[PDB]
Design a protein around this ligand. Structure first.
Ligand SMILES: COc1ncc(-c2ccc3ncnc(-c4cccc(C(=O)N5CCN(C(C)=O)CC5)c4)c3c2)cc1C#N
Lengths: 977, 249
């Protein structure tokens, strides 16, 4: 199992300076040895055999070089310590003992399996114990993707290995918005190329003006006035591919902010030789009469036998029963069927349930969704039904065999907030925890194995069709429109974007209609990636549909957008019926050919390894990734062991030392962080927020424990880059242990996507979506904004205090730029927080830079979080602009609502709000792809209906602007025209 | 407007909760979310939406004519019958205070009781999660205690195998100190195993008790969950009555 805590022993967070270790010699003797907690295994083995001579039968012991240590890990693993340069406190021992053995077996294979199991947080050997044939087949079959990617990684020269480690961070399009081009000097950009000479490392400055779309080699040629490469000053970002200079995200951002792009010229061999050579090797497990579905001539029937136990007291609940239902995604294929009600203390049924669906009419993605509910007559005539445990079963397996025979299924606890009786969005399969309610089942037998048929065996006018294709995915579609889409199913090829609408019009409980829809998607023209992602959500579970969507991403999804929407693409992996599918093969392929993609591919999976619903699927996928990711597994293990010592340190602060002052906890912090084992782990590794940022030496003088009850850690690192002054010299990150940061991560991702939509449409509304990465169960990192202060700090009671503070810092001719930046940042956050339903803002939520840039923090709650707790249904305005902000926008003028600056501020809000409304399908799809992540405020499609209200999608575009205008007037009490 | 099945201005999500787990034939008409009218009919586990204009040239003069006709007639002409209406007056009861001040005072009672039960349910869910996590931690530590005891028992086997052949040579040699040092180390090894076995024993009792604690927290939550749902819906009824019995824009 995973380790229960990050401590150095079981029940002991931190080893004492000295500790007794029971050493089990290979002659049967046992020697107690006092060791320092930071002593290496080389030192301990030498101290052991020096003392073993004073114990009996020492003549039997061989030389110490012929031995290694083995012990029981906190993960219950019998780990062999081939790396004898490791400290005792880093071995993650369950108890302080070591057994001396002679190394056997494949040494190099055991060393790699140890490093893979360390990155995943789970011993790799537990995958060998799985009896499930599908699990073992995934481990062998997925190796094709690993071989294809590593072969593609060294097919070319070291340049291919460089494109893997340092990929180009470029936009999806070379074109420039007209508000970006107008900042250029006649289409040319002034950049500064730096060169570090060979002796004394002297830096030389070279300002040069070139075309904005100059290929990086052209930039080098101007500097000469040629085989070198360019690098961003301050981080590990390289200009290796022949993209236009303006298309690189760093250069594109410099043109926006009016900042000077500082690049650095270095030789190609300086980086090509620095790259290690990744070599993938095949693991050990890779070496070691049936009827058809359409032949069966009967209706569907499933037998519920018994349930082992149910946790309910007979005083409050009257009876219990098993509710079932056949589903294709989120919709049933027939009306749900229940069992007869039985007593709570005796949960036995032995009852066949008849579903009114002919067996050949069952689709490929058909699933059985059941649960054990409790009924209570209680008051009045109505009765209350409450689910006690749920479970979902794929009616077909990966072999395509229909389920048959008896089957025991361990059920899952009902998720918090879920009030439905069934949970078709939950994962399929049995609960690994065998100490749960087990439900006995039995499917009918057809005297043979039943297999699914093969693909060979399976065979208004233009308007209104267009009007339906432009509606949002959650828009209402009537039965008249379903019959209209299905009757015009062949003309829909001219409008390929209507495919999601057409698929929901298909009668999936009809073998005839599904057979014809398969042939249409076989020859269906491609669609945009933003639209194919919808076909990967829970509403579309058909293999042919999901496969079509994956093929659209294989050809049309740039690595820019792949990294942008990677959070959602990882989430829809748990919507898959089986471990092996085209989606998981596509993502793993891209993660193994792009280290920027594979970095967050790894952490998004690793952050959910605690979740027992997806821990097996994500564990098998992380194994294949770490098996073939190359030398980056070394860097990832350094990031992991650094996060483990931060988790262990924060756990001590809020458990054993929770009742102690700030000075006592700070003294324990500075004393513990200065230890050698701690200093080796938290210095010299890549930032999990951005792997291009190198975290160097810790600045312990700047590290603090914030005054929150969760005790967040304010950490500071040096930038070991040779030119840190041109980017950032200090890297400040907030480590938080205790709070769930998934909603912050999603909201900051949505904010960045909204800002990109605005920039492409000529709206320069500057947002600040700082980094935020969930790394585990309520553990995460948060990027620090360098020169920012909350509004409360600015006040520390005049409304002009904020405006007078911005008059300072930006005094002089840079005043109009600060007011302009403050107005544009306010416009973006006023629209964004209204659409998303972010929690109410106050003097501590809102921060302002010395730049004048305003932004928000702590996006803990989104959508309609207050409707369940308070019956009133209203679309709140979280960011009500007080007079303090109005004075700043109006440059100190009284009667701020009637000024010229406020009217221009309103145009920014109207343009931004309508721009996001035009891209409503993107955000509705992004929220829909997260319905299975387990976030409490995103469980069903009814939770997504909130942005349908704020964006006013069921109205006209002109009516929606009147709605947004009335919401601003109701919150600001007037002034919005 | 006085029809039982007509609810007027209600959202599509409110119809899903009303038609949740209903039989084939349950229907209700509402103002279309924009058409003018939309009929929602439960059939085959899905809440079918049917626009009201409703197909081809109109055959009915009023909406009340369209509903009552189709209830008896069945909907086969288009492609089940409208068997069960969702009466708007069915929920008129349970709000019996019948004056503007009595309601609202009863709403304040129900809303207060709902916030008490809501905080009780939340804190119970935190004990529920914390107990589930600590049970998983104890099972892992018992797995590690199993493997540790196997290793120390292997040390007894290895000491026994190597010894005896050596202790009988020490007996003919007459060295009693060498025998005493082997038996002393064997006593030290066996006593340690007894300490590890007793440690796993106490951990199994703590897990045995904590499993029953999880079992009772689960029962308590399965009993307060139904009462929390009905208490919120009762509060929402008294709140809805207060908005209706008040000034409208
Ligand atoms: C969802 O959780 C979160 N979300 C975002 C951030 C977050 C993100 C970026 C930030 N960038 C810059 N500053 C902060 C920030 C915020 C609040 C307080 C401080 C601070 O330590 N002060 C001490 C000195 N002082 C005095 C004496 O007046 C000024 C206040 C710094 C930031 C906080 C943090 C968390 C958490 N936990």
């Amino acid at each position: 199992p995973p380790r229960p805590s990050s401590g150095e022993l079981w029940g002991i967070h931190l080893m004492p300076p000295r500790i007794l270790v029971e050493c089990l010699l290979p002659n049967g003797m046992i020697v107690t040895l006092e060791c320092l907690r930071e002593a290496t295994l080389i030192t301990i083995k030498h101290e052991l055999f020096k003392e073993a001579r004073k114990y009996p039968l020492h003549q039997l012991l061989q030389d110490e070089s012929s031995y290694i240590f083995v012990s029981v890990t906190q993960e219950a693993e019998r780990e062999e310590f081939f790396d004898e340069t490791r400290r005792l406190c880093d071995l993650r021992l369950f108890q302080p003992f070591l057994k001396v053995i002679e190394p056997v077996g494949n040494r190099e294979e055991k060393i790699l399996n140890r490093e893979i199991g360390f990155a995943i947080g789970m011993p790799v050997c537990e995958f060998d114990m799985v009896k499930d044939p599908e699990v073992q087949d995934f481990r062998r079959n997925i190796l094709n993707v690993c071989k294809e990617a590593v072969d593609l990684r060294d097919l070319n020269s070291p340049h291919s290995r460089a494109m893997y480690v340092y990929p180009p961070n470029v936009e999806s399009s070379p074109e420039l918005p007209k508000h970006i081009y107008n900042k250029l000097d006649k289409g040319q950009i002034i950049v500064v190329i730096w060169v570090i000479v060979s002796p004394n490392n002297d830096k030389q400055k070279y300002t040069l003006k070139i075309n904005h779309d100059c290929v990086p080699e052209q930039v080098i040629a101007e500097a000469i006035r040629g085989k070198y490469i360019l690098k961003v000053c301050g981080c590990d970002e390289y200009f290796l591919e022949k993209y236009p200079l303006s298309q690189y995200k760093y250069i594109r951002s410099c043109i926006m902010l009016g900042r000077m792009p500082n690049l650095m010229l270095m030789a190609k061999e300086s980086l090509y030789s620095q790259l290690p050579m990744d070599c993938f090797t095949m693991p050990s497990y890779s070496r070691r009469s049936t009827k058809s579905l359409w032949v069966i001539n009967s209706a569907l029937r499933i037998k519920i036998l018994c349930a082992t136990y149910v946790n309910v007291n007979i005083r409050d609940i009257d009876k219990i029963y098993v509710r079932t239902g056949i589903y294709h995604g989120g919709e049933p294929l027939c009306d749900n069927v229940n069992t007869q009600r039985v007593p709570c203390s005796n949960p036995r049924w032995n009852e066949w349930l008849n579903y009114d669906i002919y067996i050949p009419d069952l689709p490929r993605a058909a699933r059985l969704c059941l649960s054990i509910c409790s009924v209570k007559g209680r008051k009045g005539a109505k009765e209350e039904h409450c689910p006690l445990a749920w479970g979902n079963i794929n009616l077909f397996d990966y072999t395509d065999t229909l389920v048959s025979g008896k089957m025991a299924l361990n059920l899952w606890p009902v998720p918090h907030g879920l009030e439905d009786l069934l949970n078709p969005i939950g994962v399929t399969g049995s609960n690994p925890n065998k100490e749960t309610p087990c439900l006995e089942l039995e499917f009918d037998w057809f005297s043979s194995v039943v297999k699914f048929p093969d693909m060979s065996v399976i065979e208004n006018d233009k308007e209104q069709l267009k009007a339906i294709s432009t509606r949002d995915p959650l828009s209402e579609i009537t039965e008249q429109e379903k019959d209209f889409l299905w009757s015009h199913r062949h003309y829909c090829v001219t409008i390929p974007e209507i495919l999601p609408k057409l698929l929901l019009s298909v009668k999936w409980n009809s073998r005839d209609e599904v057979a014809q829809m398969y042939c249409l998607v076989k020859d269906w023209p491609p669609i945009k990636p933003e639209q194919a992602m919808e076909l990967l959500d829970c509403n579309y579970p058909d293999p042919m549909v999901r496969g079509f969507a994956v093929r659209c991403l294989e050809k049309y999804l740039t690595d820019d957008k792949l990294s942008q929407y990677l959070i959602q693409l990882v989430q829809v992996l748990k919507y898959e019926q089986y471990l092996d599918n085209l989606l998981v093969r596509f993502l793993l392929k891209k993660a193994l050919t792009n280290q920027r993609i594979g970095h967050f591919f790894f952490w998004h999976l690793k952050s959910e390894m605690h979740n027992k619903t997806v821990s097996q699927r994500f564990g098998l996928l992380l194994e294949s990734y770490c098996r073939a990711c190359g030398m980056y597994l070394k860097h990832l293990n350094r990031q992991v062991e650094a996060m483990e010592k931060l988790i262990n340190l924060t756990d001590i602060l809020k458990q054993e030392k929770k009742d102690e002052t700030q000075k006592v906890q700070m003294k324990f912090l500075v004393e513990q962080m200065r230890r050698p084992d701690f200093m080796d782990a938290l210095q010299g590794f890549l930032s999990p927020l951005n792997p291009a940022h190198q975290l160097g030496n810790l600045r312990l003088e700047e590290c603090r424990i914030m005054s929150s009850a969760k005790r967040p850690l304010w950490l500071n690192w040096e930038n070991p880059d040779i030119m840190s002054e041109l980017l950032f010299q200090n890297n400040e990150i907030i480590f938080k242990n205790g709070d769930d940061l998934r909603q912050d991560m999603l909201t900051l991702q949505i904010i960045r996507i909204m800002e990109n939509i605005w920039q492409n449409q000529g709206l320069d509304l500057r947002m600040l979506p700082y980094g935020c990465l969930s790394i585990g169960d309520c553990v995460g990192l948060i990027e620090v904004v360098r020169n920012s202060h909350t509004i409360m700090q600015i006040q520390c009671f005049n409304s002009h205090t904020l405006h007078q503070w911005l008059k300072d810092k930006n005094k002089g001719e840079i005043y109009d730029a600060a007011i302009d930046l403050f107005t544009r940042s306010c416009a973006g956050y006023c629209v964004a927080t209204f659409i998303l339903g972010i929690g109410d803002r106050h003097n501590s939520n809102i921060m302002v830079k010395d730049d004048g840039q305003l932004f928000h923090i702590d996006f803990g709650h989104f959508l309609d979080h207050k409707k369940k707790k308070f019956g009133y249904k209203r679309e709140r305005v979280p960011f009500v602009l007080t007079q303090d902000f109005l004075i700043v926008i109006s440059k100190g003028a009284q009667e701020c609502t009637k000024t010229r600056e406020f009217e221009r501020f309103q145009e920014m809000c109207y343009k931004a709000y309508l721009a996001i409304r035009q891209h409503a399908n993107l955000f509705i799809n992004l929220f829909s792809m997260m319905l299975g992540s387990g976030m409490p405020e995103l469980q069903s499609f009814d939770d997504i209906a909130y942005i349908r209200k704020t964006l006013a999608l069921d109205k006209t575009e002109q009516e929606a602007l009147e709605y947004f205008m009335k919401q601003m007037n109701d919150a600001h009490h007037g002034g919005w025209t | 407007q006085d029809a039982e099945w007509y609810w007027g201005d209600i959202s599509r999500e409110e119809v899903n909760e009303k038609l949740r787990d209903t039989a084939d034939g349950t229907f209700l008409v509402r103002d279309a979310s924009t058409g003018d009218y939309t009929l929602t009919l439960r059939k085959g586990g899905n809440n079918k939406l049917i626009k009201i204009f409703f197909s081809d040239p109109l055959t009915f003069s009023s909406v009340v004519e369209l509903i009552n006709h189709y209830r008896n007639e069945s909907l086969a002409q288009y492609n089940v019958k409208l068997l069960y209406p969702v009466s708007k007056y069915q929920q008129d009861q349970v709000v019996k205070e019948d004056n503007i001040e009595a309601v609202g005072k009863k709403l304040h009672e129900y809303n207060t009781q709902f916030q008490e039960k809501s905080r009780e349910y939340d804190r119970l869910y935190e004990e529920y999660t914390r107990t589930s996590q600590e049970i998983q931690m104890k099972r892992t530590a018992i797995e590690a205690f199993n493997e540790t005891i196997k290793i120390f028992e292997e040390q007894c086997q290895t000491q026994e195998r190597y010894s005896k052949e050596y202790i009988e040579k020490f007996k003919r040699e007459g060295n009693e100190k060498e025998i005493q040092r082997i038996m002393h180390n064997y006593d030290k090894l066996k006593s340690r195993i007894s300490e590890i076995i007793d440690s796993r024993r106490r951990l199994e009792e703590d897990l045995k008790k904590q499993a029953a604690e999880y079992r009772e927290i689960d029962k308590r939550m399965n009993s307060i969950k139904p009462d929390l749902i009905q208490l919120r819906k009762t509060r929402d009824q008294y709140l809805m009555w207060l908005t209706q019995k008040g000034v409208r824009q």
